[PDB]
């Protein structure tokens, strides 16, 4: 028999920090989701997911209006995850 890490190559991205609300516009949808899609559409070509997720967090930096801060958790990615769109 051979050993393998029980937990490895995960990344979680949540819409807000512990204790805190995430916002959803009743017609325009969830703000985190919309922001994530837009950053993926734009940066999947040139950035790994950790980089993309950081960019998403940056977009929420100014706590204007309905503030929230997305958070990346339980990251055990040992490598860069590039999506290589088109490939």
């Amino acid at each position: 028999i051979k050993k393998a890490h029980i937990e490895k190559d995960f990344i979680a991205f949540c819409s807000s920090t512990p204790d805190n609300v995430s916002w959803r516009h009743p017609t325009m949808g969830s703000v985190f989701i919309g922001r994530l899609i837009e950053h993926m559409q734009e940066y999947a070509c040139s950035c790994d997911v950790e980089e993309i997720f950081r960019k998403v967090r940056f977009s929420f930096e100014q706590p204007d209006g309905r503030a929230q801060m997305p958070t990346t958790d339980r990251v055990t990615l040992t490598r860069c995850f590039y999506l290589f769109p088109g490939h």
């Binding site: 949540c14 609300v21 959803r24 969830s30």
Partner: protein, 167 residues
């Protein structure tokens, strides 16, 4: 919702990126990438999550355009979510996949993600721990050494998440 059209990685951009620290991608014509979206919109004791269809549309189109076959499950209890995740983890397509995405969209509290039956009196909660456990190397050996991306749209509690200052 969103069209989900993704700017393409060019042949020379893929070259600039390519060394020994990148997740390997499988052959386009033979790989069977899978993604799962669980989205709760209608609840027994929580207001309808109006606009969830926009989220479903956008995430589905995006994940498809990134090369994933997308399964969508709606209005599930934590129990149904658990069963669905166990079934997803055992899908043989993962063996010929290089990665996966799991997207959860629901009401949420500190303890985790709300199932459709959730109430303060009788909790119906999927714990984040259980998601990882169900997709771990033991319970999902086919996704060993492959990136598992978990996306969660939910509150983590009812706080506005801010502190006030004068200066």
């Amino acid at each position: 919702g969103s069209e989900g059209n993704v700017k393409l990685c060019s042949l020379e951009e893929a070259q600039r990126i390519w060394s020994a620290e990148i997740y390997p991608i499988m052959d386009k014509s033979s790989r069977t990438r899978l993604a799962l979206i669980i989205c709760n919109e209608e609840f027994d004791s929580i207001p309808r999550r109006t606009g969830a269809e926009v989220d479903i549309t956008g995430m589905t189109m995006l994940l498809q355009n990134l090369g994933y076959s997308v399964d969508v499950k709606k209005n599930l209890t934590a129990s149904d979510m658990t069963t669905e995740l166990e079934a997803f983890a055992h899908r043989p397509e993962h063996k010929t996949s290089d990665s996966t995405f799991l997207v959860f969209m629901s009401h949420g509290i500190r303890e985790g993600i709300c199932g459709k039956k959730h109430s303060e009196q009788v909790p119906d909660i999927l714990q984040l721990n259980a998601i990882f456990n169900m997709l771990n190397t033991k319970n999902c050996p086919s996704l060993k050494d492959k990136p598992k991306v978990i996306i969660i749209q939910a509150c983590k509690g009812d706080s506005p998440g801010v502190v006030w200052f004068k200066d």
